[PDB]
Amino acid sequence: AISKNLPILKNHFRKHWQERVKVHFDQAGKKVSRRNARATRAAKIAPRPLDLLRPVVRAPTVKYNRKVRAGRGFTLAEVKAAGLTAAYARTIGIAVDHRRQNRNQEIFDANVQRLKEYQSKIIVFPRNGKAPEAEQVLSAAATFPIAQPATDVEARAVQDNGESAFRTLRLARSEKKFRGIREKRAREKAEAEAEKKK
């Protein structure tokens, strides 16, 4: 029951898998259901977009932090900055996240102008005055796209000092590896004996 010369495979089919195989024939049938579901929700939510204004937010995990992305909800700091209430924001179509806090000025300013640009573009209907017929723009998130901020230029001058960026990284790694051992070799032989010595 072993190969001629073949890669050793791990096929996880020793349970009753045949009893819980899920084939997606329903793909096309679900696709028209989701489109009908969107069309009916847009008829219900008559003049308003299907999605709420999301904030911009820098992705976690250093692998991915190089790119920004539409987060969940703005913040109590950004809402107060833009000049509205965290209650009023939720009702007039802005996701507000009670959790997230602002430690970054470029993200803060980006999202604060994103609230100001949304407020500029929407026209909120009065409660009981009159209903002005404004044909519905469906996707708010498509109206306000997530711009990946270009953080540099095309070409520049070589403002060089010649410090060997490899040698810079290698010394920075050494400073990390011997931060504690040098604090111990400074607590003894340097001090704790000088503390008694004249």
Next chain:
Amino acid sequence: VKTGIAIGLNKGKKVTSMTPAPKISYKKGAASNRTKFVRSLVREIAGLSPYERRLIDLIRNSGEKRARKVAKKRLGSFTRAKAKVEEMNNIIAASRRH
């Protein structure tokens, strides 16, 4: 503050790191002025538990190092044994002295 390179101590990108507002969740266990008054009075009435008497007995007999060694088997942790033996030292001070 971070350096600006993807290895080392503070590592990496330098942005405007300033600044959040303080969360009201972060002062979860704040003495306050109710719980101070209620915990002070409920200890008046009454009864430091049988192990709390045994720890007081061991503090005045064999110091700490035995108070804690026994307290940490009686309680769960070492961090709790420490704080227990410390509150026992304080009630010993507040009662026995003067």
Next chain:
RNA sequence: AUGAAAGUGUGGCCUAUCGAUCCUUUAGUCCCUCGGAAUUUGAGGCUAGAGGUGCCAGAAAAGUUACCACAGGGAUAACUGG
């Protein structure tokens, strides 16, 4: 190491005298790791040994059936025949 030296010597003059993984233990090394960041125990790793499998490429293992059973076998006994 020996010998004046040429040289000879990586165990027994030569042909036998022996043992994987996992586990444990030892030797090595200013070594690496314990992933939020430090130190010392502790544990884990890296390179070479040892504790052993005699069924010796290495399961962890006593009978009985005349109460018996199933898959087989003329590859194989109890009768003939050759």
Next chain:
RNA sequence: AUCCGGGUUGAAGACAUUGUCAGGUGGGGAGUUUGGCUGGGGCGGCACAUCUGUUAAACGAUAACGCAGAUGUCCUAAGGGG
């Protein structure tokens, strides 16, 4: 046909009981195992890991429960040099 206490009466008593954990005993019970080769299996044996000579037919290879034997050690000298 006495008053009072409303403790029905009498044993036993912080032992026992029960709960949890720990040691022993536990074929009453459960699960499972109970080598291989082989002039049938079994009883013998080891032809199962190795070594010498012969079988072996003058290169090498070569079987049988073929033949006559051997190994699981011994040695800081029985190693090395002179």
Next chain:
RNA sequence: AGUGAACGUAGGUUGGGGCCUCGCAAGAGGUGCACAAUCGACCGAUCCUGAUGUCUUCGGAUGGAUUUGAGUAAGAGCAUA
């Protein structure tokens, strides 16, 4: 933890189809892809070597090794049947 692929015409050598040159042709000469053997060079590992330096124990330049790798050396792969 890490580190990370050009001394040279991306190397030399023996082969090597095809193409170029001289020729009537036989042939000789040149250039030689793939592929084959081989000697090197480059990267990581292991064993050392241990410069300028310096948080005086960090840094590891420089050059070697019958050692080692499923490596580099003008990419072959991905998707489907």
Next chain:
RNA sequence: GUUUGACCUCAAAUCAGGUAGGAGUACCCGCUGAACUUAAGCAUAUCAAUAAGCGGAGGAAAAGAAACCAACCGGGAUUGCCUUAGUAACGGCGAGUGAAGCGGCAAAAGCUCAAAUUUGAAAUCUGGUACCUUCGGUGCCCGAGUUGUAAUUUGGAGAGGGCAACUUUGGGGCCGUUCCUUGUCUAUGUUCCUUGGAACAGGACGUCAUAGAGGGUGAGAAUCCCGUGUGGCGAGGAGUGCGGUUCUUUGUAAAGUGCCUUCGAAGAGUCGAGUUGUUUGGGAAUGCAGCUCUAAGUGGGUGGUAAAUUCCAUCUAAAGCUAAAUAU
């Protein structure tokens, strides 16, 4: 020792009004629980945290708005798919098993109590009775309840006190349109000949077509019939999605917002620890459970190698509600 009345706990009734079982079970929430089998044997492992067994729901269920992930320039309830990945991890480290974070997408929506002195007024609720405009409303009357029913507060906050200016609100009736349940109407050859029992077949000449889907009719029918296509005209429900639309009118009462000042309660046989069993990929122990112990208030959990000392980061447990994307 009596008089009468309370209170507390426990009863009774064929007491006024009510509710539970059982069925079904594809999917869902739990409990309990194998062996065959795989390992070329077999006891751990595996099958499998499956079948069987039992308790319990709904159109979905469960989950869910952090005692989360992370270590980033940080993300931000829940579920599902693609991916991570047959990976990190587990394992007689054999057979075999085996997640999670980030990332793209589907759908998106948030919230509620406990702990506060209403204390210049239990403001609250069931019930009974009467009347009405009856999924209810109001008056009066018994009761519940201070051993705490309402208003206010939920950590993002927020409360009390101080000063200063604004800014926004409720109810129903009536059709249209909305979603379902249906009804009805809405073109075209039965012309000629030939075989045949029958023409719905062949040949000829047309017709309609947003209708040549389908079926029926004595053989293959767009044109014979029903329907099909296209629009129309009805009637009956569920109505708050909106439009028109008219009575009011809440209100003297509620909500958001700024600066100052004092405060700022936040869940216990729990958390956690030891140990036993089980379970997990979770490895000096991932969850769960029994038993012993049993905290704290700058506190507690977590930070995937046990501890001690030192910092840091991140949440806020032991109370609770919540559609859609998913299963069938």
